[PDB]
Ligand binder design. Structure first.
Ligand SMILES: Nc1ccn([C@H]2C[C@H](O)[C@@H](COP(=O)(O)OP(=O)(O)OP(=O)(O)O)O2)c(=O)n1
Ligand SMILES: [Ca+2]
Ligand SMILES: [Ca+2]
Ligand SMILES: [Ca+2]
Ligand SMILES: [Ca+2]
Ligand SMILES: [Ca+2]
Length: 901
DNA sequence: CGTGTAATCAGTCCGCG
DNA sequence: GCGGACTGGTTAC
C-alpha cells in the first residue's frame, strides 16, 4: 500500500512522525528535516521558483529548522519579505507525501476514553487533580475492545469488583443494561490501589498509543486530569509518557472573558467529540451534557441514578462502572451515526495537515493552497499583520409582513464559491480597478460596462480572464466533492419518502428488509418489493435510509462549510491571503446578483401575466428569492386541480420549464455585463409551498427579515409523503425558547398554515388552559451565561445586570453553604425561570445549570413560586401575537352579531 | 480556540412635558 | 408604555 502519516510534530530541529509504512505497520521516525524558504531575486538570476505574481525567487536551504526561523526574524529586522511555508511540519508533509493520500482507517488507532473521579468538595479541578482517579474505560478501535480500569480501594471507599453479569441484565432485573453487543468486548481490570491502576494504564497506553484521541470533554477535563494526577503522584517525566515523544506543553486557551489550560500531547491528535459535534452538527443545543446529546441523537433514555454522583461509587459501584462504560459507548454510537471522525480524517488528509487542524478552516486552506502552488514551483507569500476592519455583507430584502398563500423559492447553488469561480477572485488574479457607479446602476443595467478586458465585480475590482486562480481552482475541487455527497444525501431522502408512502399500506407477513444502497434512487424492481413488505422490515429500511441521509448530510454540509469558510477567510486578518478587496468583491457581487435577478423575475412574470409594476418577488436574503405564485395558480383556477399534489406538479413543472430558463438568461446577460470568466450563477428551485387543496390554511407568512414559515410539499426535488414546515428565525427555531413552547408554537403555526384561523383558536385556548401542568424544565428559557463576576456586586445584581445573570445570582445566594450543590459554570448554559412577587429567593428569577434537575434543596420552592403567567406571556403569547398580526389572523375569537343567539 | 456579515429579539436604563 | 442607545445572545444566510 501507499504510505500515509498519522501524526507529525516539530521538536527542536527534528520532525517526529508516526506513519503507516508500505506494509501497513505503524512506525515512528525522527527526521532532521532541512527546510527551505525563499527570497525575491534579480531577473538576471536563473531560477524555477516564482512568487504568485510571477516574480523570481531564490531558494534558501537551511542546516536546520531553527536557522530557518532565525532567518525569518532577521528579514523582518531588515524589512524584506521572507517567502514560503513557515510551518515546517506542513512543508515536511508536502515533501514526504507528494501525492493524493489514500489512507486506511482500519490501520489508524482511534481511542475513546472517559474517566471517573469521586469528589466530596465539588467539581474536581483538572489543574489541581487532588482526588483519586477511580475508573477509566478506554475503547481501542483496532482491538475493538473496551478496557476497564477499576479502583477497588480508595480513601473515599472500598468496594467489590464490578459484575459483568449484573451489568448485562435489564434495569428491571436490577441490572445496568449494558448493551449485549458490547458485553463480549469488555476487558475488565480491577486494581487494589490507584498507583498500580495508573502504572498499568500507562504501560497499556504505550502498547496501544492513540493516534486520534477522543471522548466527551477529554481535552478540557479527562486529559488534563489524568496528566495532572499522574504528575502529582509520580512526577513530570512519568506524566509525559502520555506523549509518544515524551513532550507535553500546557497550552493556555484565551477567549474574550478569561482563560483555561489544556495539555498538548505531542504525537497525538486530540479530537474532543463535544467540539467535533459543535463544529460539524449544525445544531445549537440547550445542553451539551452527554446524556442530553445522547438522548437527542440516539433516542436513548437518560442514565438514571439515585443521589449525587459524589456518592454513587460507594452507594452503587456496580452502576458507577457500568455508566462509565456506557458513556464511552455512547460517543461511538453518535459517531457511527454522524461520522465526524471519518470527516475529520478525509479533510485532514486532503489538506495534508495535522488531523486536529480541521478545526481551523484558515489552516486547512493555507495547506491546500500551499500544496497546490508547490506543484507548479510557485512560492507562497509571507503572512502579514492587519488591523481588523469592518466590511459589507449580503443584501436582505425587507418583506411586507403578511400571509402568503402560494410560494416558490429559488436560491443559488453554492453562492459565494460560485461567485469566486465565475469572477475568478484570487490573490494573484487581481488585474486592477474601474470607476464604480452606485450599485443600483448595475442592478438596473444602466451603469457603463466596467471592462472590455477583465472579469469584474461591482465593488470596483478587475480580474484576469486568461487563467484560473489557485483559489478558484482549489475551491472547485472541494465543491465537486460536496456535490457528489449532496447527491447521495438527496437520494437517501427521496428513498425515505418512498418507504413512508409504503408504510401507509404495510403487508401482513414475515420477511426481512431489502439489502440496498440508499445513496441511489430506488429502481422500479426495488419499489415493487417495498410495496409488498411488512411494517417491521419497512421501518428498519426507513431507519437505514435515514442513517444514509445523515451520513450524506455530514459529508456535504461540512464541505459546504469549508468552501464557504474560504470566502470568509479572505476577510480574516490571520489568513495568509486576507484581502478586503477580494472579500468585498464576493459580497458586493452577491448583492448585485440577488437584486438583478429579482428585477429579471418580476419583468418575466409581469410579462406572462400581462401586468406591469407588480412585485412577484416578495422576499430574498443573500442569494435567494421567494416568488408569489397565487396568480399562476389563479390563471388555471383552483377548481381545475384534482388534489394538492396536482398543483404541486404544476408549479414544479412551471418552475423547471418556464422560470429556470428565464432565470438562466437573466444571469447569462449579467455574466456578460460583468465580463466574467464563466457563467456559474445557477438558481435552482428550492421550495414549493401552499395550503392543502380545499383547506382554510394560509400557506405561509413573513413577520420580517429572516423570520418566516412555509408549508412545503416539495423541497429540492423531494416530494413529501406529508407536508413539512419550513420555519426560519421564529421562536420555534431558537435554543433559548422553552422546549414545550417551541412545540406549542410549532403546532399553532402548523394549524395556521394547514387548517386556518379557527383551528388555531381551538389550540391556543387549550394550551392556555393546560400549560401550568407542564414539567418545569420543559417551560424554562435557556441562555448562555457569560461574565457572571462582572455583574456580581456582593451577591446581588450590579448595574445593567442581565436577566439570566440575575437568575444565576439568585441561585448562588439560595445554595450558599453547599460545596455539594451544582455550581453554574461561566460560559455554559442555564435554564431560567420567572418568580412571582414575594417569593423567598428575594428576586424576580432563578437560573440553574442547563440539562439538569435543579438541586433538591430548592426545587420544591421554585415549583411553588414559578411565575406561569409571566412565562406564558413572554415566551408564547408575545411571539404568537407577532405571528398572527403578521398573518392578519386572530388567536382569540372576536365577538360577532351571532353571539346574540 | 477554531472563516465572514445581516438581522431580530429580550432586557436595562431612561427619556418623553 | 414605547423608543433609542446599549448590552447580550442567537439565528439566516
Ligand atoms: N454558514 C454559512 C451559510 C451561508 N453563508 C454565505 C455563503 C453562502 O454561499 C451564501 C448562501 O448561503 P446558503 O446557505 O444558501 O449556502 P450555499 O449557497 O453556499 O450552498 P447551497 O448550494 O446549499 O445553497 O451565504 C456563509 O457565509 N456561512
Ligand atoms: Ca461519566
Ligand atoms: Ca444557496
Ligand atoms: Ca439548490
Ligand atoms: Ca403494501
Ligand atoms: Ca439560500
Amino acid at each position: 500500500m501507499k504510505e500515509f502519516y498519522l501524526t507529525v510534530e516539530q521538536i527542536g530541529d527534528s520532525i517526529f512522525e508516526r506513519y503507516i509504512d508500505s506494509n501497513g505497520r505503524e512506525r515512528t521516525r525522527e527526521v532532521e528535516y532541512k527546510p527551505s524558504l525563499f527570497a525575491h531575486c534579480p531577473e538576471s538570476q536563473a531560477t524555477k521558483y516564482f512568487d504568485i505574481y510571477g516574480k523570481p525567487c531564490t531558494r534558501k536551504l537551511f542546516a536546520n529548522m531553527r536557522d530557518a526561523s532565525q532567518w525569518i526574524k532577521r528579514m523582518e529586522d531588515i524589512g524584506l519579505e521572507a517567502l514560503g511555508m513557515d510551518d515546517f511540519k506542513l512543508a515536511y508533509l508536502s515533501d514526504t507525501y507528494n501525492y493524493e493520500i489514500k489512507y486506511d482507517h482500519t490501520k489508524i488507532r482511534v481511542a475513546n476514553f472517559d474517566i471517573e473521579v469521586t469528589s466530596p468538595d465539588g467539581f474536581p479541578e483538572p489543574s489541581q487533580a487532588k482526588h483519586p482517579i477511580d475508573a477509566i474505560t478506554h475503547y481501542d478501535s483496532i482491538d475493538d475492545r473496551f478496557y476497564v480500569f477499576d479502583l477497588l480501594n480508595s480513601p473515599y471507599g472500598n468496594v467489590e469488583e464490578w459484575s459483568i453479569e449484573i451489568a448485562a441484565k435489564l434495569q428491571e432485573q436490577g441490572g445496568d443494561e449494558v448493551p449485549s453487543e458490547i458485553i463480549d468486548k469488555i476487558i475488565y481490570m480491577p486494581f487494589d490501589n490507584e498507583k498500580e491502576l495508573l502504572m498499568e494504564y500507562l504501560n497499556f497506553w504505550q502498547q496501544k498509543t492513540p493516534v486520534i484521541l477522543t471522548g466527551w470533554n477529554v481535552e478540557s477535563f479527562a486529559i488534563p486530569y489524568v496528566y495532572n494526577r499522574i504528575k502529582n503522584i509520580f512526577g513530570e517525566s512519568t506524566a509525559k509518557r502520555l506523549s509518544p515523544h515524551r513532550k507535553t506543553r500546557v497550552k493556555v486557551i484565551e477567549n474574550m472573558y478569561g482563560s483555561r489550560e489544556i495539555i498538548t500531547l505531542f504525537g497525538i491528535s486530540v479530537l474532543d467529540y463535544i467540539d467535533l459535534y459543535k463544529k460539524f452538527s449544525f445544531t445549537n443545543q440547550p445542553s451539551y451534557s452527554l446524556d442530553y446529546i445522547s438522548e437527542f441523537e440516539l433516542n436513548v433514555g437518560k442514565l438514571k441514578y439515585d443521589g449525587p454522583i459524589s456518592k454513587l461509587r460507594e452507594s452503587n459501584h456496580q452502576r458507577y462502572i457500568s455508566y462509565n462504560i456506557i458513556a464511552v459507548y455512547r460517543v461511538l454510537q453518535i459517531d457511527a451515526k454522524r461520522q465526524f471522525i471519518n470527516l475529520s480524517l478525509d479533510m485532514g488528509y486532503y489538506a495534508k495537515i495535522q488531523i486536529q487542524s480541521v478545526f481551523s478552516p484558515i489552516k486547512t486552506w493555507d495547506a491546500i493552497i500551499f500544496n497546490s502552488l508547490k506543484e507548479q514551483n510557485k512560492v507562497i507569500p509571507q503572512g502579514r499583520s492587519h488591523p481588523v476592519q469592518p466590511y459589507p455583507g449580503a443584501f436582505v430584502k425587507e418583506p411586507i409582513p403578511n400571509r402568503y398563500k402560494y410560494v416558490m423559492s429559488f436560491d443559488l447553488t453554492s453562492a459565494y464559491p460560485s461567485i469566486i469561480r465565475q469572477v475568478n477572485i484570487s490573490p494573484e488574479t487581481i488585474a486592477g480597478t474601474f470607476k464604480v457607479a452606485p450599485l443600483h446602476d448595475y442592478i438596473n443595467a444602466v451603469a457603463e460596462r466596467p471592462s472590455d478586458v477583465y472579469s469584474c465585480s461591482p465593488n470596483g475590482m478587475m480580474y484576469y480572464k486568461d487563467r484560473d486562480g489557485v483559489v478558484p481552482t482549489e475551491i472547485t475541487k472541494v465543491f465537486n466533492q460536496r456535490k457528489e455527497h449532496k447527491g447521495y444525501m438527496l437520494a437517501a431522502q427521496r428513498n425515505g419518502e418512498i418507504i413512508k408512502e409504503a408504510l401507509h399500506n404495510p403487508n401482513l407477513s414475515v420477511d426481512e428488509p431489502l439489502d440496498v444502497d440508499y445513496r441511489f434512487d430506488f429502481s422500479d424492481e426495488i419499489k415493487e418489493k417495498i410495496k409488498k413488505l411488512s411494517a417491521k422490515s419497512l421501518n428498519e429500511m426507513l431507519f437505514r435510509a435515514q442513517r444514509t441521509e445523515v451520513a450524506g448530510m455530514t459529508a456535504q454540509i461540512n464541505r459546504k462549510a469549508l468552501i464557504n469558510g474560504l470566502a470568509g477567510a479572505l476577510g480574516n486578518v490571520w489568513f495568509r491571503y486576507y484581502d478586503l478587496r477580494n472579500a468585498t468583491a464576493i459580497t458586493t457581487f452577491g448583492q448585485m446578483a440577488l437584486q438583478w435577478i429579482e428585477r429579471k423575475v418580476n419583468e418575466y412574470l409581469n410579462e406572462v401575466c400581462g401586468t406591469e409594476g407588480e412585485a412577484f418577488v416578495l422576499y430574498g436574503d443573500t442569494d435567494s428569492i421567494y416568488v408569489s405564485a397565487d396568480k399562476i395558480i389563479d390563471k388555471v383556477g383552483e377548481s381545475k386541480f384534482r388534489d394538492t399534489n396536482h398543483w404541486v406538479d404544476f408549479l414544479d413543472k412551471f418552475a423547471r420549464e418556464r422560470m429556470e430558463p428565464a432565470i438562466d438568461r437573466g444571469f447569462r446577460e449579467m455574466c456578460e455585463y460583468m465580463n466574467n470568466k464563466q457563467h456559474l450563477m445557477f438558481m435552482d428551485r428550492e421550495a414549493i409551498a401552499g395550503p392543502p387543496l380545499g383547506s382554510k390554511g394560509i400557506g405561509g407568512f413573513w413577520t420580517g427579515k429572516k423570520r418566516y414559515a412555509l408549508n412545503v410539499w416539495d423541497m429540492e426535488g423531494t416530494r413529501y409523503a406529508e407536508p413539512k414546515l419550513k420555519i426560519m428565525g421564529l421562536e420555534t427555531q431558537k435554543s433559548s425558547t422553552p422546549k414545550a413552547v417551541q412545540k406549542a408554537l410549532k403546532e399553532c403555526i402548523r394549524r395556521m398554515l394547514q387548517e386556518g384561523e379557527e383551528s388555531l383558536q381551538e389550540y391556543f385556548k387549550e394550551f392556555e388552559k393546560e400549560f401550568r401542568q407542564l414539567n418545569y424544565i420543559s417551560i424554562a428559557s435557556v441562555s448562555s451565561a457569560n461574565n457572571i463576576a462582572k455583574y456580581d456586586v456582593g451577591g446581588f445584581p450590579g448595574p445593567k445586570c442581565p436577566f439570566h445573570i440575575r437568575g444565576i445570582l439568585t441561585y448562588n445566594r439560595a445554595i450558599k453553604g453547599n460545596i455539594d450543590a451544582p455550581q453554574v459554570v461561566e460560559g455554559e448554559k442555564v435554564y431560567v425561570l420567572p418568580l412571582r412577587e414575594g417569593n423567598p429567593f428575594g428576586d424576580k428569577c432563578i437560573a440553574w445549570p442547563s440539562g439538569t434537575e435543579i438541586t433538591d434543596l430548592i426545587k420544591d420552592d421554585v415549583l411553588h413560586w414559578m411565575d406561569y403567567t409571566v412565562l406564558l406571556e413572554k415566551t408564547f403569547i408575545k411571539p404568537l401575537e407577532g405571528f398572527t398580526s403578521a398573518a392578519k389572523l386572530d388567536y382569540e375569537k372576536k365577538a360577532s352579531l351571532f353571539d346574540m343567539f
